[PDB]
Design a protein around this ligand. Structure first.
Ligand SMILES: Cc1ncc(C[n+]2c([C@](O)(CO)[C@@H](O)[C@H](O)[C@H](O)COP(=O)(O)O)sc(CCOP(=O)(O)OP(=O)(O)O)c2C)c(N)n1
Ligand SMILES: Cc1ncc(C[n+]2c([C@](O)(CO)[C@@H](O)[C@H](O)[C@H](O)COP(=O)(O)O)sc(CCOP(=O)(O)OP(=O)(O)O)c2C)c(N)n1
Ligand SMILES: [Ca+2]
Ligand SMILES: [Ca+2]
Lengths: 675, 675
């Protein structure tokens, strides 16, 4: 049949791609080709409009199997060709060894790190439910799409998927349909060596629906029926158990050796002949397969055409919502939304930056409907919920509604991070955030790094940034955390010192389209600074106190800017004139012009950094660094600062030593380099 | 009864400690006091010998509840007193706001970051099973102890606990007995808002035994019976569901407000009067409670006394095993064990450092019985198993034995990291390791940081360290990872360049008693270096190529040392004389004498670092830094190095620019500072 020919075509494209690269993973593509064929036949999508907001989404969570995904995209006429398949795993190609959303048309997210994709699917489905609840009206199903996810044993072993699966079951996400590649083989061999749990019983315990397909090597009728069954269960996510043979058809099928290395040439020949293909030919695409797939594309394009007319009629019937939806699909924030950002003066009271963050959210959430977010069981400590908003919950629970804007993530930082990536991936201008303590953002590093690589504008509201949190002690107090994330490409790490800087940090985070943000916020109160503004803090680094005859410049962030200002006064009494630079975001600063940066960190003056955490990175901006390179302590926060000499006198002492160290030396800006 | 008085004493000590600090968590201590009383009565331990190797272990995974743990330790006469309780959460005290094994007698591990402690308990139980299988003989139950863990809803939400619980069920760890504080309250309120899964059904799906105690606020008889029941189930870990009221007895019992803030003074008064205590008194310890607890201590001490005689008789009956056990309990490695480390010369072939690591393990595992380890489903890629060894599995599976030495962790990096901490915490000189790709050590950051804070000598065998891995691409290629871990206090991060350096890295990792190690290892082959040795590499940094008239010194690590050596030859043809420093471990180097370090990085010469990852940290050792501060690429590894100019010519160009940049300047060692 044509279906059988399509499945063989998919299998052989994937094998041939791996063969051409002499690198990659043929086993799961061989095993999952029937399911991929069946799922894509049920999916609504437009290869010529990858951003249609009512498309079904597909996520390959077992991203090593991406020769399968690329083969589907090529066969369906996405902007990816057989010539691209021939360049699988080659430098600069559109077919990298794991899928990258920035590079691969039709890759919704970046996978390869196991466990992430299923969580991203949870986030796509969460966003779809919120979006539909916000916009759909009687006779206007603006959003009714599904989220289809493939995942393997490795994804099911990774704890992040347990977190997201528990939460997705709680949230009754009925448009999520996941498929487990139940092939009983991982890199170390049989799953009997390490993974003997009853997966289906576990998924039932989360409140998922289950469908089992015992012969998923051939039974596409049952796979299609499982999708239809899943669509009838509107209040539970579904797991479809696909019992497959890894490497189906290979001489080496059912073995770990077929997971992750190219097949032998004679094996590929026998695959081809058993399936009616020419063993002398590679990258074959039978025209009848193209014709069949083109029929489905044409039907999907007519569905999108009708959706466009539905949307036009929606704008006439619901003018306000229609204009809001249009603006979001255009990628534009509300005009002058930033006029809602709070502004402060030096006469205003001292406030912790966690509380300033609460106040920002309170003002901007009503103005910007595409902001949603939550906390990982730290809502009353991170201060992440705007009073009066409703939680995102299924209405059946009585605890919220899908139109809600605040997500109770539970104690699930890693899944929160990956779910945030999925919400961003949904599109529609979602600007979404997640609260935890800065030290526990580290639990989510796997997902945070992918926010950066995937270029998603997600935001971590990362409170309790330092030893300033006090008594909870060193298991809670960051030391290495900012260095870790600043050292990751494409992460804006804001550490605002006061009210105006906190507003600048949010302006950046919400306006972002390609850069994730981490906002490092305090438990303890900080004064409003003389010289701060949204305008200057938006530059990432700025001169807070200008001193034309400076003996030293002190560059600082966050809670240490006020400390630097107090140290300047101590230094005055010692006959030393200091300037102060505030550096709320190193990435934003780095992106400013060379001349702007040199105006902040000029030649001819020693520069001392002050930040109560690791000194790593700080030599970009300073000659000497005063930081904290040891773990913290459990005690009242002011006593910890005193212990470590983060006091006006301790800063002044180190500043005076810095001035003395450079006496008789020629000093150039830390911004200069040899290459 | 005295039991009732003991429970009240525990509750009120915990509340009074929180009150004195005006900080901390009274709710779970109030709810778990009955269970703590019952468990400690069943436990065998010696307050005067916290290291008795056959003690039962207790782990408080819900570490915020540590006022409960501290109260138990005080009441039992550990080296912790009521005066220490009065200093709860105060700077420098022995009663920090979360338990620290380095600080608190009777704290086996450091908890506070949720999810970790239960995984540590899995590791303690894994070690006990391996230890018992290694040493026990007929009539000689050298090791027969249990591992008791308390954990809450937050621990059950964290994915790391799912990973470890799946694995513990697979491993049939019948001496693990965990207790879930089922109080239905977390920080964000009722668990109905975020955590509605059927926990018991999930634990059954992992192969755990379940006991439910429906009135754990009072029914210590049932808690004791649950322990007895768990002890009869020798082939499954047990979860005991303790249905409790958070804050039991408080006016605010059963609310989120009692989780994490001090009780009101009038609330404490009514607690005291309802339980027969004086509301005017704090830190009361009724002498009848002390007497009852002392009886149990005296009995436990007689049990340890008999164990000491059993051990003496064991040494007579099993002389070789007895001497091995004695040496391990003394904390000593085998005499001259390091003579087994492989040594190489520059005439030997190029080898990837992952393969050099395999070869080291092959030589040292037979010589050092306290080495055990595993991989997170990457055994044939990390090369972490010595040929001929048997896996750690329950014999019932046919796949291994508890005497085995190799652990199949599955795709569970985070739990692997926390399990490694538990194996170290068991003691008996265990030197344990865990393999994954360096980029996925980041999945385990929560546990890695605790290895550092807890001072455990665990080892990560972290292969595939860079873009040198090639085609798997940027989702697999570290950039930020070494900077992150080097910026964490107390982590040795070895990046050996060749065979001799890899042996030095293992010498350090195995000899460690207080510092975790990460060994960053290559996929790709590297040459044996002229000038390397175990002796010099043991210093962490050393002069590989000395040049008395150097125009520049190039400092490098790992795969970039050979690159620096090749660049030196290019530079010679440009009339530039270079020296080369190899810096296999920055932490070890930092610990050398100031004079040694200056002999490696002298004044008066520009120094350029070369390492194909983040430049963060490198200014400690260099004036200019050539690194990779962007994500990688999917392609053949040599092509990626060429793309980013990590070639002999690209290094030479930057070295020549560095020499020119410092012409006419006075240059002092990067090791100098102002303070
Ligand atoms: C978070 C995480 N941890 C481990 C992995 C590693 N891993 C993976 C890879 O890194 C690919 O993403 C490796 O396959 C890698 O490409 C090779 O080991 C490289 O070989 P070499 O030639 O360099 O030696 S896949 C994998 C588990 C496979 O088990 P599954 O059951 O999920 O997939 P299957 O049905 O067997 O195809 C596992 C465990 C990952 N991708 N993500
Ligand atoms: C990995 C991780 N994530 C989050 C936490 C935070 N957290 C915790 C803490 O950081 C303490 O370790 C906080 O309590 C913290 O002390 C306060 O929020 C500070 O308040 P503030 O005055 O500074 O505002 S506890 C916690 C969840 C509590 O739920 P459980 O059900 O585990 O405990 P319970 O029965 O309610 O006592 C949660 C979620 C953690 N300890 N570990
Ligand atoms: Ca599998
Ligand atoms: Ca709880």
């Amino acid at each position: 049949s044509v279906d059988q020919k399509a499945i063989s075509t998919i299998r052989l494209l994937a094998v041939d791609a791996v063969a051409a690269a002499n690198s990659g993973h043929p086993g799961a593509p061989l095993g999952l080709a029937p399911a991929a064929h069946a799922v894509f036949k049920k999916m609504r999508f437009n290869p010529k409009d990858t951003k249609w907001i009512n498309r079904d989404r597909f996520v390959l969570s077992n991203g090593h199997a991406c020769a399968l995904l690329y083969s589907m995209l090529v066969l369906y006429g996405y902007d990816l060709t057989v010539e691209d398949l021939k360049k699988f795993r080659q430098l600069g190609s559109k077919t990298p060894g794991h899928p990258e959303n920035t590079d691969v048309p039709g890759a919704e997210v970046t996978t390869g790190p196991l466990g992430q994709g299923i969580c991203n699917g949870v986030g796509i489905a969460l966003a779809q439910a919120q979006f539909a609840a916000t916009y759909n009206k009687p006779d206007f199903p603006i959003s009714d799409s599904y989220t289809y996810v493939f995942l393997g044993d490795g994804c099911l072993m990774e704890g992040v998927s347990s977190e997201a699966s528990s939460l997705a079951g709680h949230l009754q996400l009925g448009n999520l349909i996941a498929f487990w590649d139940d092939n009983k083989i991982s890199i170390d061999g049989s799953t009997e060596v390490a993974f003997t749990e009853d997966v289906i019983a576990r998924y039932k315990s989360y409140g998922w629906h289950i469908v089992e397909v015992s012969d998923a090597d051939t039974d596409i009728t049952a796979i299609a029926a499982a999708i239809d069954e899943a669509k009838k269960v509107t209040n539970k996510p579904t797991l479809v158990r696909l019992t497959t043979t890894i490497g189906f058809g290979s001489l080496a099928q059912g073995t770990h050796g077929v997971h992750g290395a190219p097949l032998k040439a004679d094996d590929i020949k026998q695959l081809k002949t058993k399936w009616g293909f020419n063993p002398e030919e590679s990258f074959a695409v039978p025209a009848e397969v193209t014709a069949s797939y083109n029929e489905h594309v044409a039907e999907n394009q007519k569905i999108q055409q009708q959706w466009n007319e539905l949307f036009a009629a929606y704008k006439q019937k619901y003018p306000e919502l229609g204009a809001e939806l249009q603006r979001r699909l255009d990628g534009k924030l509300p005009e002058n939304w930033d006029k809602a950002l709070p502004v402060y003066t030096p006469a205003d009271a001292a406030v912790a930056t966690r509380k300033l963050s609460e106040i920002v959210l309170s003002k901007i959430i009503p103005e910007v409907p595409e902001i949603i977010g939550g906390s990982a069981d730290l809502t009353p400590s991170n201060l992440t919920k705007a009073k009066g908003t409703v939680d995102f919950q299924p209405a059946a629970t009585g605890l919220g509604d899908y139109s809600g804007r605040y997500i109770r993530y539970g104690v699930r930082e890693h899944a929160m991070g990956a779910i945030m990536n999925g919400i961003a991936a949904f599109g529609a201008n979602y600007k979404n955030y997640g609260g935890t303590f800065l030290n526990f953002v580290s639990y989510a590093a796997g997902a945070v790094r992918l926010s950066a690589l995937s270029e998603f504008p997600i935001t971590w509201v990362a409170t309790h940034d330092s030893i300033g949190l006090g008594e909870d002690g060193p298991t809670h107090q960051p030391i290495e955390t900012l260095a870790h994330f600043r050292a990751t490409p494409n992460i804006s790490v804001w550490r605002p010192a006061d009210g105006n800087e906190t507003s600048a940090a949010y302006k950046s985070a919400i306006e972002s389209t390609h850069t994730p943000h981490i906002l490092a916020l305090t438990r303890q109160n900080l004064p409003q600074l003389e010289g701060s503004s949204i305008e200057k803090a938006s530059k990432g680094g700025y001169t807070l106190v200008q001193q034309d005859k400076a003996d030293i410049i002190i560059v600082a962030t966050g809670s240490e800017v006020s400390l630097a200002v107090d140290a300047l006064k101590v230094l005055e009494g010692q006959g030393i004139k200091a300037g102060v630079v505030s550096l709320p975001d190193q990435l934003t600063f780095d992106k400013q012009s060379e001349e702007y940066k040199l105006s902040v960190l000029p030649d001819g003056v020693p520069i001392l950094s002050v930040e109560v955490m690791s000194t790593f990175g700080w030599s970009k901006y300073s000659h000497q660094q005063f930081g904290l390179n040891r773990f913290g302590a459990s005690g009242k926060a002011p006593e910890i600062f005193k212990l470590f000499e983060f006091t006006p006198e301790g800063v002044a002492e180190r500043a005076a030593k810095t001035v003395a160290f450079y006496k008789g030396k020629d000093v150039v800006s830390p911004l200069r380099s040899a290459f």
